[PDB]
């Protein structure tokens, strides 16, 4: 619980 989570591929337009 800490290290930010890596956003998904291709940001949401």
Q: Which class of secondary structure composition applies to the elements?
A: little secondary structure
Oligomer: monomer
Would you report the number of β strands? Answer: 0
| Overall spatial form | rod-shaped
- Gap from first CA to last CA: 28 Å
Query: What is the gyration radius calculated from CA atoms?
Result: 10 Å
Question: Major β-sheet, in short?
Answer: none
Measured as a percent range, the helix fraction is under 10%
Query: What proportion of the residues form beta strands (DSSP E)?
Result: under 5%
**SS element count, helices:** 0
Structure overview:
The chain has 13 residues and is largely without helices or strands. The protein has no helices and no strands. The termini are far apart.
């Amino acid at each position: 619980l800490g290290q930010q989570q890596p956003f998904p591929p291709q940001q949401p337009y």
